Write a protein that binds this ligand. Sequence first.
Ligand code: HEM
Ligand code: HEM
Ligand code: HEM
Ligand code: HEM
Lengths: 146, 146, 141, 141
Amino acid sequence: VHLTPEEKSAVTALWGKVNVDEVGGEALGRLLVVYPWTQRFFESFGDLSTPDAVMGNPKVKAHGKKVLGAFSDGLAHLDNLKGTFATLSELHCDKLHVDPENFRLLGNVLVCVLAHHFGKEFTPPVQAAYQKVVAGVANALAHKYH
Amino acid sequence: VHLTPEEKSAVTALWGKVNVDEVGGEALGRLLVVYPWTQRFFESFGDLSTPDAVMGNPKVKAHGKKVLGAFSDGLAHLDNLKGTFATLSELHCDKLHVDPENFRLLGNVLVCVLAHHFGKEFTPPVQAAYQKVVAGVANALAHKYH
Amino acid sequence: VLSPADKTNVKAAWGKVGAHAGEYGAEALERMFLSFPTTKTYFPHFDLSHGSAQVKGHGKKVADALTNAVAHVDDMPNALSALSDLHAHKLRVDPVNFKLLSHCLLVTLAAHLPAEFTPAVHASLDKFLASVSTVLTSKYR
Amino acid sequence: VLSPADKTNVKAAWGKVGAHAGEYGAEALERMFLSFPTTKTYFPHFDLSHGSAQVKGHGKKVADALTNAVAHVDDMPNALSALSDLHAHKLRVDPVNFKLLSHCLLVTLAAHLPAEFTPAVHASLDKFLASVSTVLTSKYR
Ligand code: HEM
Ligand code: HEM
Ligand code: HEM
Ligand code: HEM
């Protein structure tokens, strides 16, 4: 993505405060509760019957941590997101055949999660910067569809 | 995009029978009728107040020819749709900011028009060949976003 | 949300499908499976060969649902209620696919009802399928 | 289509929003113009700077429409006929834009309701914003 000098600074500053053991599961977690068809891809995870089952699900937390890790990688290579996400793109596009629209949904609820955590700190300018990232990432994950 | 040789011939055969003076206008017109928000983009064409107005609009039929032409080009450069549309992607992405979903909607209405004109001749197999070209063009046009 | 014009158009059109519904629903399906291979993941056990009697039988049920959908166009959530659970609760079908089948229904129609497939009707029909799709993709039970 | 639970959820969260609706509606608009500047093309004559009294006022307006929609959840198409006429027919707003204000409104709520924005609330509020968007992007008159 683009990200101005002060933007990357803000993104970075905020991400430093992100809890890597929790946020990933919070996003993947809400992805499944809010966009229920996404659950079709995680049947092997166990009970996803209610929002409580989804959020408190061990595999959802453990997997989400990985998802969060892919994002962290992105943050470290904003000038090469497609390269950074090449492997994942093959996995999500050629293997799993995840419609690119969901890459966009995960990215956004992520933003909601970040928003839910940082509150007032997650300013419109800060959000704006994160939308750039989350858009690059999603586009990167969908590269194999282009 | 990849079209089997047998596909490229079905697409090619069919397109040779395409009324190049009308098809593009039918497609552009239906886009605007079926997806009215796209009209905002062509407001300078004038009266588009109704379906017949849209389909009867001269600038629609006129501009449609350019659109069909673009499709003929990509159809002649399926090997390099991205480069072939680099200039159109700059226009539709950087200048107009047409949402990439609309590119997909137009390709699809083109497919309905082709079905409408060729009836039974536009067989499932032939359609599938066209969904490939069409999706490739949309992707090419959205390249400046990707 | 359908205008009264839409209900008119849709009924005019779909009514001309009549006895053809099962066939057209089958063709739409086939068109879909051929055009968008991934849609096949929802019918893994299914015999999806060109003449598949299973496919033809299935499209009959799909096409009938649409007829019932058209009849109760002002009460699709109640009418399609069961199909909603099925697709949204049970099948967890990704909404995108409903856009593909819809397009395929539309292509099928256009290929078969040349005179009826006018821009306006094509417009209502799209909206209609967009509503059916919303209903079938919403969890409200 | 909203489940009784979604409606219960929506009415509940929106109550929690209480007096702060207009504010949030304004913060949503701002977040959107910032994150997705293309949306600005729709408000050429507006002063879109941070403290914009204009954006603040349009925000109360967006919120009262939502509060109105929440109040007539079962009867939104009729409830919002005017606004639908405005957005769908008149302004022809690309429906892609609604997902953007919707997302910005959720993000706004996520940032202001650290104690009430639960996964369920988020989900119900999303489905709700989606219905609202479907109504305002439908030409049903
Ligand atoms: C920006 C969004 C996304 C990112 C960055 C991302 C990242 C990841 C990563 C890191 C992995 C694990 C790699 C490994 O196997 O070690 C993965 C796997 C997977 N992702 Fe995603 N993903 C994203 C969106 C999605 C979406 C939207 C879906 C579909 C609703 C999805 C479904 C899956 C599945 C099924 C797996 C494999 C899980 C398993 O069977 O163990 N992902 N993802
Ligand atoms: C399927 C992909 C599409 C193709 C093949 C295509 C192709 C073209 C071509 C050939 C031009 C003329 C460029 C020039 O000579 O200056 C053009 C212009 C334009 N297109 Fe597209 N287009 C597509 C989709 C769309 C969509 C979906 C929209 C927006 C709803 C759109 C909006 C426009 C606009 C605003 C112009 C200029 C109109 C004017 O003269 O005012 N196009 N397009
Ligand atoms: C216009 C929208 C659609 C309508 C009207 C429709 C209607 C139906 C009906 C009537 C049934 C059969 C119920 C029965 O036989 O008792 C069904 C089953 C099913 N549908 Fe849909 N459907 C729609 C969209 C989709 C889409 C988009 C997909 C996925 C690509 C899909 C996947 C399935 C599957 C997997 C089954 C179950 C097949 C089986 O296991 O036998 N449907 N649908
Ligand atoms: C749930 C989403 C939305 C709601 C509830 C909503 C509601 C409203 C309301 C209440 C008005 C006031 C009009 C009057 O005074 O009668 C309005 C106007 C307007 N809306 Fe929206 N709106 C939504 C989405 C959109 C989107 C996403 C756009 C486009 C980016 C947009 C663009 C406009 C414009 C340009 C006006 C006219 C503003 C002016 O010139 O004063 N709206 N909207």
